[PDB]
Amino acid sequence: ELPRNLEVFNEACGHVFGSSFNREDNSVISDAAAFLFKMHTHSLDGQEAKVLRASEKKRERENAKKSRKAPEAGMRVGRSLILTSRWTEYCATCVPALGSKMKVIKASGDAAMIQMMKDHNSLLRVCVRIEVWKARYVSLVALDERIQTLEDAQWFPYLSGDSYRACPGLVGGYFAKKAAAGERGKNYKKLNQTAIIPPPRFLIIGHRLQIGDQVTLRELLASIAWGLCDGVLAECWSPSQGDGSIGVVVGLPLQATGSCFLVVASHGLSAIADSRIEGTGNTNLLEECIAIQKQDGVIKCKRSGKSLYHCLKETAG
Amino acid sequence: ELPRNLEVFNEACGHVFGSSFNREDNSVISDAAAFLFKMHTHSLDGQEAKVLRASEKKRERENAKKSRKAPEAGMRVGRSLILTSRWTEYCATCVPALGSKMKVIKASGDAAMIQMMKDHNSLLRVCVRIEVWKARYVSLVALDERIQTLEDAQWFPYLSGDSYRACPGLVGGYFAKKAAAGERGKNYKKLNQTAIIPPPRFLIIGHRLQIGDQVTLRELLASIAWGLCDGVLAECWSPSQGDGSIGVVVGLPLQATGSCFLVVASHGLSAIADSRIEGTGNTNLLEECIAIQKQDGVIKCKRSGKSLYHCLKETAG
Amino acid sequence: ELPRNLEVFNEACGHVFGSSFNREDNSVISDAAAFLFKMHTHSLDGQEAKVLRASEKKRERENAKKSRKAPEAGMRVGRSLILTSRWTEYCATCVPALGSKMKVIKASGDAAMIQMMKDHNSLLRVCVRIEVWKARYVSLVALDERIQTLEDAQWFPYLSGDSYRACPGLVGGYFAKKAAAGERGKNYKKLNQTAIIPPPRFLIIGHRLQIGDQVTLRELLASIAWGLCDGVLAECWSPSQGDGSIGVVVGLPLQATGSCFLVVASHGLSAIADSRIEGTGNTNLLEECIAIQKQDGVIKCKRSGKSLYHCLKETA
Amino acid sequence: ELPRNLEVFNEACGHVFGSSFNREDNSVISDAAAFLFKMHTHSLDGQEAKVLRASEKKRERENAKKSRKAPEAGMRVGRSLILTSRWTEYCATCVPALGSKMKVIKASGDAAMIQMMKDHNSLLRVCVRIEVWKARYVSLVALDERIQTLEDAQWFPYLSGDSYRACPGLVGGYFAKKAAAGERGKNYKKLNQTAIIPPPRFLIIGHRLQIGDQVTLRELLASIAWGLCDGVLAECWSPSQGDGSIGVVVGLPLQATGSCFLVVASHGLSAIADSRIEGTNLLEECIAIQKQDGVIKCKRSGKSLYHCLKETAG
Amino acid sequence: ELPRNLEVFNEACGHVFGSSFNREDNSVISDAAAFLFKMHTHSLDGQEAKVLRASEKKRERENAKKSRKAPEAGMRVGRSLILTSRWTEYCATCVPALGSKMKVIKASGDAAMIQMMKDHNSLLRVCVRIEVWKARYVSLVALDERIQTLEDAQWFPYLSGDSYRACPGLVGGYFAKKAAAGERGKNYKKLNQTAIIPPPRFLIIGHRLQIGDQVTLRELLASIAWGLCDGVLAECWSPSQGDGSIGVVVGLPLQATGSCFLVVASHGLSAIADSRIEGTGNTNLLEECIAIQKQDGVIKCKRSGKSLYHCLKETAG
DNA sequence: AAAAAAA
DNA sequence: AAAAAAA
DNA sequence: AAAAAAA
DNA sequence: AAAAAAA
DNA sequence: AAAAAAA
């Protein structure tokens, strides 16, 4: 009924949070995913210290974390997430020991341990996807101070190293910048800043985002873009009968990933660094378009020239 | 009559300097505040050596400071500040011992000790505010050799770690740069380079700067801006009858909130550095205006396009 | 009937894949050539470890490869390639031993060994040519994430060291970059990025690509150019009667290896990047033309100003 | 009569060169200052090798220097400088021992040693000021092969580490580049590439350069600028009656040091990287020359001082 | 009659080639100089192997060179050069042993060895000057494939390491690139791409190139410029009576070396990255002139805006 | 917009 | 433009 | 355009 | 456009 | 758009 990743995530969240884990609230799912990600990276209190090559300051911080008592049952997480009494058992059972690697487990040959490690990897990937989607959802109506120029915005989201490792194609930030600056191997994944990510309530259920879905404007925009994206993407939504809060999806943007506008010299031609700019691109900027695929077909929509955050702020005035 | 902070500062300065501390001279007040900050930071000769995690060079420097004789009574400070014979008693009484922390004092429960620690913290904050104002006043006519570009000027004033700790929102420099670069938590405070600070002769009295105050051009500018702020802010001053040296404040600037107008490249659209300017192509910056709020109302004044330091230098030729 | 190289490749592919090796599918031929190149480079499981100067990590990887079981008969390769039970015999026989060099064999003087070494070199050259063509065919619709600027795009295709060594005149990548950075000896060869390469279904048969051949648009473009070449090259193709999928070639590009028109700064003058453009100063890059040779004659076609990849994406 | 620094320099030059040291020749004074600087930094032959943390190559070079015989009396220095037989005594006495530090001397408490160290420091400062002046004078007519772009020209003069330490505000080069690139403390000084330096024949006498003094065009330009400075500065010089070789100073440049044209963004304004650019023909600019009558703005010539000096001689 | 350098080169060439060495042919002199350079760098077959720090591949190559038989007397060199039976004696006697350094020879105190090393250095310098001149002469009628852009053309000629070491102010290539990129000591010498090099038939004789000399167009151009220099330089040549092939030099270019067009910011002025480009009015490049000094006087000749190679190619068609 | 590596 | 944390 | 630190 | 260093 | 060397 469900793939391995989604089933593992559902089981883990249900076990850790019991019945307090609502299965239809984006905020609840994002908070639960963040907590599970912290648990599975040994970021919670009372777990193994990360000291393999840590600096003395990092060693002190990890020692303080280890000394600190672990979270207790009944503790409130986020807004409406309450820990059960069994969460310690789950953390002890399903969490790989610090430093564990897939090669070591494979050498061991224990099928149960291999399955547990696969479940842990899938859970990390799912939680990082949910974390990226929540970062986009927050950034629609809350500017990040660190993002002041195009260069600063070029690496959104800014997530920890574990997030980058779990999903290098979606997660940006310092680690993505480091990977791009350094040597690029055959495994290099470029940052698909505007990759389509289903809403968490859809991601856990496995329902792929598509036309006809009943989704709020903010969550749809967080799914297909973020705050500093061109406002024209708002055209991918249409309020339902009686306005309300939930509308419908009318289409999806095209060219979401893989946009390269280079032309190399050949056969006596001249190299071009940008197809769009060549000629007089400054006057053609606001004349650009985006291809939106709808149920009927593809349509080109003129760019609004205004940030998504600014459009949402203005329409909310 | 006066808040706790100003009263504590007045008592401390009176005790240390007696009658030699003028209550109407900005330079004297700034020198006294700097000396008091040094005393409460254990930066004077003969005070506790900082060795908790000091490097061998730092350990040697602190040992040299400790071995050196402490300042004697009657020692000249700055220009017109003379230490009183009772300054040693005040230093011994009102200066918490090195390493003092509010948590430990609260655990002790001594009401007198808690009040003393609160007074010390208030004195630190007041002294740091006076230090920042004096840095602005100095930079109006005497640039800093460490400021060469906009990136360097983004961290003015350049003050020590203690000043940044006391007033993180007003004090820039190396520590502000470090804080901005690293992780930003809920307690992170952005550097307000041009935060309003009344002159020290007003700050100790608590008289908030407002329209109609009889202040000098340079001191007003240091109150609202610094050397590299655009010269248009000079419109906030007006010479009084007969010119002279003291005029009157006609208005104050308004700090605009944070609002980024970027539009990153997405789905084939070209990046926009600024939505407002890209469309019509009005790239000229000299047209920009500042909102000066006056007694009559708010007025948009066109920028001069020249640094405040340059304007002051040219008008003083 | 066929040259030595194509005959060697045909015999090798027939022996290794038997009847499962289709002779008219470009994807199948490309996969077979890739597998043969892997086999003759001792990169498969169970072959000699490359340790002559390997680093400890490289030594570990090669030891892991050697310890691993060799591919078994009937194993599925690519999509429609199945290994025959006699592939092990060919691998043992026709594959030169690791570290073998032509000088050593010539000193030995065994005519059969010399012929085997020559056949192996020809097989490497043919396999690498097919690999380069397949790289071009892939790049027409799926950009390489390692290409983001013109500097990086200058070194396409990005192939391994073996590919560069076998065919230095077609293969780019890190090794070609290193060769360019270092000394340029008399044996140095520049990367002819857009060198015409017949499709594998043509290369193995020896049928040189020319006008009138019934070839698909994508395969023709992969033959004469790659993803980031200008879209104007699409003019070399023309749909046949009834459209369908297979058309015909109407012309081929004329490789413009013209002499440099630079004038370096000297005696206080100013450097000129191009003496021709200096006069009129027509700074419009959309006016350039490419000389396509057709059956009737050569014609100058105006550049489209858009990447071949973008034109293909829009037309699809 | 004279400050400590100039008196110390005059005494040292008299002791080391006797009467052969001409007090009115810029080249001779510069060469004598360079020799004294080499002596007081322990660079001449026969002085202690520098090995504290030297690399094997540096250790070998300094061992070679130590083994090599010390300079002999009567040796020709520069062009018209001859060593005296007593120079060895001065080198042994007034030169601090290698590694001497003012803190150590102060801890010792010997007044004579403290005075000697102060004299050594003043001599180093004076010698490096003269060295920078001479570097400017040379660069007027003989370009440096190391200066090819404005980025390279930004660090003139290129002088040894001892020169940078003696006067970090004037000297440039690799050490100034390192100081600028790295962390800058409260002691940081920016490279004042056109700070006014009196000519050596004036510097040792202590006569501050001012309008009316009889100086040569080349030496005045060296005092106020160098080769790659905009040629308009030549307006500061006026030939005397009958041309000849010596003229007079009419005016001096202003804003020599401390020119910043930034405007940081504030109160919603936009940051301006350059006030001049936001106003843009470069050749229209002017430089403020202060004369006896008053300040006058002279239009920039747009041509490097070296080019103008070369063309005026052809 | 002749300086030490030219006398040494003449003696060495006569000893190694005897009467087969023509004293008026540029190709023959260039070939002889190249062969002597190969001999004096221990690059010929059967000479000392360079193994001090050579890589294993380099060690193999040098071992192969050492094992190979040395050149035999009577071998044909170039076109019209034949080795003499006494060349082995000269190679053994006048060639310093591999690794010989001037410091070691001076320490030994042997006057004869010091003189031999001086002769070796002078011969290296002369051979490298001739090699650079021949490189220019080749580039006039044969483009170098390695030169495709202005940056590539900036380092011509591309000569080996020994050539760069002997004459660093005339020889470019990888080693000049390395010297420019790395630290620049006081001894640093820039690459004078258009220095005046007398033709080999004049360089060995010591006759400095001057006005009125009977030199062919191609060899004059190779003397004063190279393939990708401005075509205007052809004005420095004039066919003699009856045309023929040999003409006469009517003038020489000025500003051959040491051309800097920088003005630095000082006293509030603005930095000029290039005086020519910044010149008042948009100076069209084809309007630029070169100063040719002639017997009568200097004349400004307008640039032809076309390469010397292309001018020669068109004039020969 | 599958899996295997992996401050 | 209040307090509590805290090179 | 004073003193104290100090490849 | 002299001499000494010295992939 | 023939062969020989050969991270």
Residue numbers in the entry:
A (entry chain A), B (entry chain B), E (entry chain D): 34 to 350
C (entry chain E): 34 to 349
D (entry chain C): 34 to 312, 316 to 350
List sentences quoted exactly from the publication behind this structure.
In addition to the two tetramers, pentameric and hexameric oligomers were also resolved, displaying pseudo-C5 and pseudo-C6 symmetries. These higher-order oligomers resemble the pseudo-C4 structure but incorporate additional NPs, resulting in circular assemblies with diameters of ∼107 Å for the pentamer and ∼122 Å for the hexamer. The NP–NP interface areas are smaller, averaging 1240 Å² for the pentamer and 1065 Å² for the hexamer. The pseudo-C2 and pseudo-C5 oligomers appeared the most stable with uniform density according to local resolution, while the pseudo-C4 and pseudo-C6 structures displayed poorer density for 2 and 3 NPs, respectively. In the pseudo-C5 oligomers, up to 12 nucleotides can be modelled per NP. The RNA-binding mode is conserved across all NPs, with ∼930 Å2 of RNA surface buried within each groove, making the RNA largely inaccessible to the solvent. Only discontinuous RNA density is observed at the NP–NP interfaces suggesting two potential binding modes: either individual vRNA loops interact separately with each NP, or a single vRNA loop may bridge two adjacent NPs, leaving a flexible RNA loop at the NP-NP interface. Assuming TiLV-RNPs adopts an anti-parallel superhelix like influenza, it is tempting to suggest that the circularised TiLV-NP pentamers and hexamers may correspond to the loop found at one extremity of the RNP or could, perhaps, correspond to a nascent RNP formed within the replication complex once the RNA product begins to bulge out.
